[PDB]
A paper describes a structure:
Glutamate dehydrogenase (GDH) plays a key role in the metabolism of glutamate, an important compound at a cross-road of carbon and nitrogen metabolism and a relevant neurotransmitter. Nevertheless, with an exception of the family of large 180 kDa GDH, most of the NAD- or NADP-specific GDH are homologous to mammalian GDH. The latter enzymes are hexameric, organized as a dimer of trimers, possibly forming complexes/aggregates of higher molecular weight. Mammalian GDH is one of the first allosteric enzymes discovered; its allosteric inhibition by GTP and activation by ADP have been known for more than half-a-century, but the structures of respective complexes have been characterized only recently. The activation of mammalian GDH by L-leucine and some other hydrophobic amino acids has also been long known, yet no structure of the mammalian GDH with leucine has been obtained to date.
An improved 2.4-angstrom resolution of the GDH complex with ADP is also presented. With the higher resolution achieved in our case, the H-bonding between the carboxyl group of D179 and the 2′-hydroxyl of ADP becomes obvious. In addition, as a consequence of the ribose C2′-endo pucker conformation, we could not observe any interaction between the ADP 2′-hydroxyl and R551, in contrast to the previous models. Of the bovine GDH residues involved in ADP binding, K548 corresponds to human/mouse K545, known to be acetylated. As Figure 3A shows, this residue helps orienting D179 for its interaction with the 2′-hydroxyl of ADP. Noteworthy, no ion is unambiguously identified in this site in the binary GDH·ADP complex, crystallized in the presence of Ca2+ (20 mM), in addition to K+ (2 mM) and Na+ (500 mM) (see chapters 4.1 and 4.2 of “Materials and Methods”). The presence of a less significant peak in difference density maps argued against the presence of either K+ or Ca2+ at significant occupancy. Considering the shorter interatomic distances to protein atoms and the incomplete coordination spheres in most chains, we eventually modeled the species bound to the same site as water, although the presence of a lighter cation such as Na+, or a mixed situation including the alternate presence of Na+ and/or K+ at lower occupancies, cannot be ruled out. In the absence of leucine, this C-terminal part is mostly disordered and could be traced for chain D only.
Residue numbers in the entry:
A (entry chain C): 61 to 483, 487 to 557
B (entry chain F): 61 to 91, 100 to 481, 488 to 557
C (entry chain E): 64 to 369, 374 to 556
D (entry chain A): 64 to 281
The structure:
């Protein structure tokens, strides 16, 4: 089981909504410009906040599967659609015996608010199939995936304009490919956008370039947008920028490895890396390429030659930035006063308890919340869906056009200078620009789309925080920002 | 709350399936082979789909309210699904799942080609105005339609004791105006509709007439009656009805019409008794002017149920647990006719089997409304009332037959005219007569099917197990022969 | 039907009927509302019913056979959707207008309601004179008009089902169905139900050509067999010893004469556009039809002398023209006026007939047999089978088994002494069994429809104390039915 | 735009323009036809372009906030379908007429063609004075009018895309999109493209408020 399977995490998400809804309520009635009495206005605001909170639809399924040995098995599955204020719905599919209707409902609500902070036009959704994937062959997993897709499609729980699922830590790109293939072959055969019914697909099936590193890149951009803001950094007693900064990552998965790599690339020194099985530490620095290569040949980071065996988690290691990148409860009321980092970057869902949040606010520690920082994969999910709607890879028709314009601009500078100083002044691209031009592909535009989203959303969260004088309570600002946006869609629709 | 809201009634339905499935299992393999039979029985048992909804409603005072609702579709072996909608704070997902499964087996015993379904909206209708009940009904219809939980060929809802024909009219009107606007059969998305909206004639008494026909089919079978020590027919028979709603009143009026004497009538507030007989028209008129049957001049008051009154036929016509292990040995009736769902516990069933008391089960006896539901759905598909083009044709053929007999006899040797009863049948011929014949035929065919199933498995007076086995055999064959 | 005064008539008939039902509708309401709110609901619903809900005006191009282009103007009004699909004819005439198409659509709503045909009213008009176009150009106009209606929800088996008119026929209806089924309704299993009046080879129904005439007979028969209404007119029930006169010897007039004569009524006079004939001893319909088929006219008929004021019991205006006005209404000698066509009696003549105790059976009911059979054609196309196809042989065997049972029972009762008692069908029954086809079931459906609607109109007239004002009773009956659909929805 | 003389003006502008292009259009025809048949094609096509192809007149009920019912009269003309969808505003005014809606639809066809906007012209009018109605009643009118247009092919992302007017605004456009996406266009991924002039929170575009003024400058 994960932190996302924990019933206490579901109560947390509900509490974050309740806190945010009570803060926006008073300001929403003032901004209502409708020709109603003040009593009608408050009823409308409270009424809409009451509609937003619960999941609109939950589908429970029972479907048969014939095992490879010939015996039959009844599979139990569910999918919750929290909100339709934005269609289609969006959300992953978990294959786990630890799934429940309450999990699927809470994670669907979390997805609604996460999409709203990063301006992704989808309501939240979440599915769960109550099976342990380790107990099934690839053929049986395909049968389960294809039949589950069929039952969701017949009831409006999968479709390019209805609900677009995605993979999870328990599911992958091959299962997403089977979902799209089943939908396009049967229910969505007459739909030109049938392959946009699901994201996380392989590149050969309509997948998007830049999906594997989307979350890690989003964690970097999120830290970057706050670490370059001198107003927030002066409050933490630090200088802006990644230079002369130290960081520690708890969880060396795909998000842990990618964050570690991009922070290192910008001058930040990794002093410690934590894993499910022990931790490593080096105050002089840990190279991400050397550590990734070690883990790929030994299965673990334990025994890394250029680091010491640190006992337990690295949450209390002396660093500037702490990055919880694993889906588990890590920061609690007992270890929050022992945290030595000034910035806590949540690169996973729910690593900090509400009691730890309170301690961090008292200690002037900035927590960049999961609702914002863990939205990179969600942002590139949106771009994959758009790519399938577009029916073309990003930049396909404009890369060569841009390249010729760049050369024409450099030639114009060269000719103008030769004319001004008389007669050669060669104006050529740098080694880095030439490499960008030669290797120009879809991933560069997806990375750009993600960087712009994390930057625009960081400023939105900073503005929402300064409006309600929340200071370093970025989590409440992100929830208030999400609830304000969802409220306005319902209010202006009638 | 009702007996249909009780969690113990859900366990009962599950137990009836488990009992029936273990009995058919051995005979199904005869007709790797045991894996297919057990596998299909494992697929049949749980509900395939359950939809949970949360939808807003603006009250008449201006305030908003979030309404919680659900709809379960137990089976799609037959499409569309079919099942009522309950408006009650006592509804639950487990209720809606168990009642959907009950509807799959009930439809199968009466050869109604629908999978089972059931909906529930967690509200107390007494706390809402008619305008608010319309808002709830129309929004619930919209949310079901968008997810495949209402449609002429997908899922056809119906009313309940908590809902009526006005709500069904709103469902059909909302569906035909929005989601099903392009569907020629949009008005077939729901049954229990008023006549002005595509409803069928003969829907009001459908359940009551089904109870009468169900009883009549066993009461006129001398093989079953000799085992109970009785003569066939309703003549010289006595009966008692527990629950004087619409089913109890109709069943009382129909048995009386055929010679059976009503010795006792039970109600939620006390009961009345007269060994010489109670007239149904006199009792109905008394209740319509006083609100209760208490104080009826031609009967004596009794504080308690009539379940232990000396009679031949006992008719539990109210949806509540009445026959339990404590009062089952005190029952003096030889036939127990279940006019409501779940009035007898499994422990009482066992006592009745030991005492040679025949229990006509609810799965069969309470399927008259479900049968005429099928006919209303067919009427909306047909887009014409039953008999509209053939009544006059039949009348002319009958007159031509009588004229042929008259002419042949006058040639050989004489007015040949219809009887007063036949003339009245011809003159008053309307849709209700075809619906009544269709219901009587269904009840008669299903009774013989249940009798043959009971004789095939040597079940004797265990008609409930026979009805469940009959239903499971039919549902199994659809899955098995489809692949 | 092109006359603006006829549109004002239909509007006036609605206004008269709506004011009569208004008081009884509030009293019959069982809703949880105040009395002032219940009155607002009744007037509000009557205000919704009166005007046409939708009117579509079209402009579409046509390439003439000479190569030149022409812009054709057309319209279709759907008066009501309380019952879907809509139903109504298509007129090809330069005299069509939006007001015509709106008034005739409203008339069709009330006509469908009195005979329990579940369709809202509709009417289309294409502003062209069909005599100025070739068959190829008429096909082009028909197919393009069908396309423009289909794209806007003005034709479809479950949306709007058009029909022919006096200006249009079965070939045009066939082109409508063929255009719809080949393009917009290609994926519809019921595409051929998008229009009625089709030829038999295209899904048409048997019994369509004589539908109006059979309905005119059945409408008369249902009031003539009612002793209560006949005692008020000083007559005995039944067609025996009854005399009748028919004004207009077309398909309706001839058929009405043919069926009335078959039941004992004696035709004393027949009127035509060119003169009239008269014989108090009787005129044979078969002899008169054969004479007209070989001479083009009824003038010079040997068994008659060379008819609204003729002494008879039943007067049947069967031609679409103003015949009964305030000037000749006091000279009418008939006790029953059977309107076999639209608008033969003015409102002033209706008043005179009510004062003189003359029963006028209204066109809204009596001239609705064609509409009744149109519903059956639409049903036939939905059924995808002809009526009786699977049951004629079954019924025949049951009839023989019944006669055999009577024969065996009598031979058993009277013994061998006496002999065989053959029980065989009459010559008429044998002919019915041998020639059993769809038209016999369509004729049954029509007779039952007229019978049931006659009793409904009688009950409405008794409910509102209208007496012999059957026109107001038919309009009130139609408005009550349309109101109840809106109110209970 | 309510003035009958303005409608005659638009008709006169078309007649003037059509007579000028007529002579040059026959020369540019490269089809294998006779010169007389070439002129028949040009004049024939100009005769098709001039009138509105479709005009829908509606009568729909509305329950006022006081409980009383009111029958609302409305219309929508689609001048041309040479480019689909059609495009055009909705006016809420007691001064609207079928002739207004037809002339302004034709004006929109030619306006879209000069700015290479691929839409045919369209125009709607609802015969009501918005000042006499509450916001709740204006929402009821807007949602019911949307329903009646959608059922007859007079609103849809690929059929006819309405817009606001000086008498209507972004809240009404939001109600149109919400009604269409909830009922008739529920299965359409592009349901929110059924109308323009929407608020930003409902799919509106940035730069819409200053669009006419900027175009006047440009
Ligand atoms: N998931 C969402 N829920 C609610 N509102 C949203 C959501 N995503 C975006 N919005 C808001 O809807 C509006 C759409 O604006 P637009 O300019 O089209 O998109 P964006 O600026 O997000 O790229 C913005 O105000 C945006 O903040
Ligand atoms: N709800 C049901 N589930 C399973 N089988 C059914 C159901 N209803 C009917 N059947 C069976 O399906 C078959 C249909 O037979 P058919 O003669 O067409 O209909 P019926 O005899 O019931 O009028 C029969 O064997 C019938 O018993
Ligand atoms: N065109 C119509 N408009 C309104 N009500 C109608 C119309 N046609 C029929 N009705 C009524 O609707 C109801 C339908 O009853 P039903 O028994 O299904 O049909 P019918 O008896 O006409 O064959 C009847 O009360 C009938 O009078
Ligand atoms: N509303 C319209 N009606 C007719 N032709 C149009 C209309 N809008 C654009 N066109 C023409 O159609 C062609 C489309 O050309 P294209 O290059 O695809 O578009 P554009 O140049 O307008 O961006 C052009 O010749 C353009 O002038």
């Amino acid at each position: 089981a994960d932190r996302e399977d924990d019933p206490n995490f579901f109560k947390m998400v509900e509490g974050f909504f309740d806190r945010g809804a009570s803060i926006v309520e008073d300001k929403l009635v003032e901004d209502l410009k409708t020709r109603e009495t003040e009593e009608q206005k408050r009823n409308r605001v409270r009424g809409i906040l009451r509609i937003i909170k619960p999941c609109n639809h939950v589908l429970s399924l029972s479907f048969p599967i014939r095992r490879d040995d010939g015996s039959w098995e009844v599979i139990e599955g569910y999918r919750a659609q929290h909100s339709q204020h934005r269609t289609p719905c969006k959300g992953g599919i978990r294959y786990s015996t630890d799934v429940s209707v309450d999990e699927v409902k809470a994670l669907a609500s979390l997805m609604t608010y996460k999409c709203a902070v990063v301006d992704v036009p989808f309501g939240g959704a979440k599915a769960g199939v109550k099976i342990n994937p380790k107990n099934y062959t690839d053929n049986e997993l395909e049968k389960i995936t294809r039949r589950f897709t069929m039952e969701l499609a017949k009831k409006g729980f999968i479709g390019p304009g209805v609900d677009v699922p995605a993979p999870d830590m328990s599911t992958g790109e091959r299962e997403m490919s089977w979902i799209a293939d089943t939908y396009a072959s049967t229910i969505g055969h007459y739909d030109i956008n049938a392959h946009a019914c699901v994201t996380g697909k392989p590149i050969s099936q309509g997948g998007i370039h830049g999906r594997i590193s989307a979350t890690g890149r989003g964690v970097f951009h999120g830290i970057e947008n706050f670490i370059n803001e001198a107003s927030y950094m002066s409050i933490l007693g630090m200088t802006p920028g990644f230079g002369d900064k130290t960081f520690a990552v708890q969880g060396f998965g795909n998000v842990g490895l990618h964050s570690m790599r991009y922070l290192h690339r910008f001058g930040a020194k990794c002093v410690a890396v934590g894993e499910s099985d022990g931790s490593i530490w080096n105050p002089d620095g840990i190279d991400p390429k050397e550590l990734e290569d070690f883990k790929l040949q030994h299965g673990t980071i334990l025994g890394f030659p250029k680091a010491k065996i640190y006992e337990g988690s690295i949450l209390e290691v002396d660093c500037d930035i702490l990055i919880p990148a694993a889906s588990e409860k890590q920061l609690t009321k007992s270890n929050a006063p022992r945290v030595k980092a000034k910035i806590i970057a949540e690169g996973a869902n729910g690593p900090t308890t509400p009691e730890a949040d309170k301690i961090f606010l008292e200690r002037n520690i900035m927590v960049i919340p999961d609702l914002y920082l863990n939205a990179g994969g969600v942002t590139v999910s949106y771009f994959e869906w758009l790519k399938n709607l577009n029916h073309v890879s990003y930049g396909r028709l404009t890369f060569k056009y841009e390249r010729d314009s760049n050369y024409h601009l450099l030639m114009s500078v060269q000719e103008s200078l030769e004319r001004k100083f008389g007669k050669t002044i060669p104006i050529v691209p740098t080694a880095e620009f030439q490499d960008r031009i030669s290797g120009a592909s879809e991933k560069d535009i997806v990375h750009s789309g993600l960087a712009y989203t994390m930057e625009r959303s960081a400023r939105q969260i900073m503005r929402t925080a300064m409006k309600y004088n929340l200071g370093l309570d970025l989590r409440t600002a992100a929830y208030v920002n999400a609830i304000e946006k969802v409220f306005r869609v319902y209010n202006e629709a009638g």
